[PDB]
Amino acid sequence: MRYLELAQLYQKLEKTTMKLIKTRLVADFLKKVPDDHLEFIPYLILGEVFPEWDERELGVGEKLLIKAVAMATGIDAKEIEESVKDTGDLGESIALAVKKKKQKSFFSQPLTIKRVYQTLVKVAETTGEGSQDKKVKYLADLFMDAEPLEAKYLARTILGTMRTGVAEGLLRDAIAMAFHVKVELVERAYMLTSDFGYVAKIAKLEGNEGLAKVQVQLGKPIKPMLAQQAASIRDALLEMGGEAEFEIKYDGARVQVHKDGSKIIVYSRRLENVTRAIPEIVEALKEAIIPEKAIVEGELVAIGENGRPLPFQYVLRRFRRKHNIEEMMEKIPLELNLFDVLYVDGQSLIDTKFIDRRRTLEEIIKQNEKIKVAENLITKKVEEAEAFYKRALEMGHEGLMAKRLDAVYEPGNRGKKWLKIKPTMENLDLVIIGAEWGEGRRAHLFGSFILGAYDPETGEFLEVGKVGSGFTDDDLVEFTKMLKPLIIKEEGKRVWLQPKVVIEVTYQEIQKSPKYRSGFALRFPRFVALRDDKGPEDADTIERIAQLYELQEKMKGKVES
Ligand SMILES: Nc1ncnc2c1ncn2[C@@H]1O[C@H](COP(=O)(O)O)[C@@H](O)[C@H]1O
Numbered sequence: 414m415r416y417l418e419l420a421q422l423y424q425k426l427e428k429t430t431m432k433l434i435k436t437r438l439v440a441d442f443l444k445k446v447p448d449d450h451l452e453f454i455p456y457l458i459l460g461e462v463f464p465e466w467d468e469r470e471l472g473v474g475e476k477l478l479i480k481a482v483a484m485a486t487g488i489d490a491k492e493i494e495e496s497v498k499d500t501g502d503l504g505e506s507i508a509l510a511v512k513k514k515k516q517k518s519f520f521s522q523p524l525t526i527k528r529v530y531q532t533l534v535k536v537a538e539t540t541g542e543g544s545q546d547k548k549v550k551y552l553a554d555l556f557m558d559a560e561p562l563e564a565k566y567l568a569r570t571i572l573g574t575m576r577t578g579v580a581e582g583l584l585r586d587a588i589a590m591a592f593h594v595k596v597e598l599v600e601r602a603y604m605l606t607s608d609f610g611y612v613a614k615i616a617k618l619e620g621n622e623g624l625a626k627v628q629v630q631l632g633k634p635i636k637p638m639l640a641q642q643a644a645s646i647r648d649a650l651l652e653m654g655g656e657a658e659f660e661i662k663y664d665g666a667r668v669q670v671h672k673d674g675s676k677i678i679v680y681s682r683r684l685e686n687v688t689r690a691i692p693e694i695v696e697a698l699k700e701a702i703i704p705e706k707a708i709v710e711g712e713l714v715a716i717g718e719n720g721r722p723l724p725f726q727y728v729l730r731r732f733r734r735k736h737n738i739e740e741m742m743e744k745i746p747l748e749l750n751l752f753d754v755l756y757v758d759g760q761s762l763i764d765t766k767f768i769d770r771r772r773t774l775e776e777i778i779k780q781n782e783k784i785k786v787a788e789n790l791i792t793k794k795v796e797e798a799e800a801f802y803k804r805a806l807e808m809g810h811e812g813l814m815a816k817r818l819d820a821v822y823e824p825g826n827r828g829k830k831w832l833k834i835k836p837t838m839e840n841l842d843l844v845i846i847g848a849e850w851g852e853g854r855r856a857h858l859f860g861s862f863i864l865g866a867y868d869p870e871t872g873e874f875l876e877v878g879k880v881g882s883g884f885t886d887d888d889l890v891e892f893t894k895m896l897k898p899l900i901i902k903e904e905g906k907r908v909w910l911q912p913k914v915v916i917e918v919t920y921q922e923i924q925k926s927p928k929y930r931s932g933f934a935l936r937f938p939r940f941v942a943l944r945d946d947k948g949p950e951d952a953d954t955i956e957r958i959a960q961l962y963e964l965q966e967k968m969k970g971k972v973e974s
Pocket residue numbers: 637638639640641660661662663664665666667712752787814827833
């Protein structure tokens with residue numbers, strides 16, 4: 414299949430604002446894709462080369478890209494740069510360079526999707542000595558045969574700036590539509606493997622039966638099972654049927670570990686491969702995990718000099734690797750509190766009752782300085798769990814998790830099989846979808862941020878509030894530098910932003926406002942932290958908010974006596 418057909422799809426996608434039309438376009442295209450392109454085509458359709466959990470990345474910036482295009486077209490980098498000043502878009506200017514290339518090298522050897530994909534992969538894997546020059550050459554080889562339209566999309570694909578309105582929801586729907594399979598099964602398989610390519614392939618070749626048989630695949634992250642919040646230990650035990658597994662709810666960053674022999678991959682909550690950020694934990698895991706193959710997950714916690722937990726922000730700091738891992742391992746010691754096992758030696762435990770998974774976890778983990786098994790208590794006595802809860806809080810943790818003993822693991826689901834019990838309404842993790850410049854001496858900084866809750870089915874982020882409290886001057890400076898590149902529209906003090914930054918905020922109250930489309934509004938939110946271990950698509954949803962609203966109202970309804 415020619416890359417031109419894919420470029421033509423991108424163009425059609427950009428020419429419609431309609432999700433249903435986009436779904437159709439993508440589905441029709443998926444139907445034409447050769448079977449051996451299915452494993453990667455979904456990502457290319459999203460304008461990405463690899464799944465977010467891959468670790469591989471094209472180490473190509475605007476300059477290197479321009480250099481490759483200049484090399485491929487015979488047009489000076491400066492000229493391409495000067496073109497951007499008139500076009501306002503590098504993609505369009507690259508298309509022009511390629512269009513002009515016709516004068517000196519008129520015939521192209523038509524780009525195939527296969528060649529483009531294989532090239533991008535080679536580029537990403539070229540990190541050796543003179544990786545940069547090699548990447549320029551691979552890309553130049555590609556742009557030499559590109560048609561203008563193709564070049565524009567190849568460029569945006571390389572830069573990660575593709576703007577097709579295709580989100581995971583639409584891609585899921587497109588796969589279901591293209592191969593006449595149940596969207597629920599496409600979703601089930603996606604929650605288990607986080608791999609749209611894998612899911613699409615199976616959908617096409619095996620249909621529903623195949624999708625229903627999909628099991629976790631070692632190395633591919635499983636979307637984490639989430640939890641609803643209960644008002645109290647008592648309420649949690651009641652919901653559980655009178656008995657439950659209780660565990661300390663550790664305040665750190667959730668990670669998922671895949672082990673194959675001595676090979677370890679650790680994924681963060683947003684499924685970023687963060688293995689490289691925590692070498693000491695990886696080493697500890699090779700030792701702590703007994704079975705050759707396993708997938709387990711836990712809460713990675715920063716530990717202070719007094720042995721108590723440090724703020725979870727410290728763990729997220731470790732993930733960003735802004736300082737040398739060497740210094741940070743010293744400055745920010747970590748401990749991983751494992752709380753689930755989803756696979757062991759070729760056997761998926763997703764459909765295994767929790768009690769068996771926990772027993773397996775206890776059996777498979779030889780705890781060490783770094784790797785621990787979450788402390789638990791299985792009880793039917795509210796007072797026992799309450800004592801455990803009190804202790805969890807005195808220990809500096811968040812409270813307790815209560816988990817149904819007979820429940821299977823539900824990838825990506827925020828059900829009631831796992832419940833969180835805390836002393837306060839949990840903070841919301843929302844997407845910054847806009848901001849407003851501050852006033853007076855703060856006019857050069859964003860001083861307020863519009864928060865959006867993610868909508869999976871639609872892919873958009875609906876406004877649920879505006880936070881302008883809790884940020885120190887430095888926070889404002891940092892967020893302004895971080896968000897300026899995301900501006901997509903500006904109007905007075907108001908700026909609209911690409912939905913990419915998730916932040917945690919407290920709120921005085923969740924209000925059910927007829928006002929906004931979301932139906933909700935947060936009363937006086939306050940900044941708590943940057944939650945970059947969560948992608949925009951991992952942010953709290955309207956449903957999550959509605960759930961907290963119900964909890965809030967349930968408690969207000971109980972006020973007095
Ligand atoms: N023992 C535990 N079991 C499960 N989740 C835990 C535990 N300790 C801390 N956590 C965190 O609590 C969260 C509960 O689900 P949610 O609040 O929906 O993210 C998980 O995502 C983890 O980050």
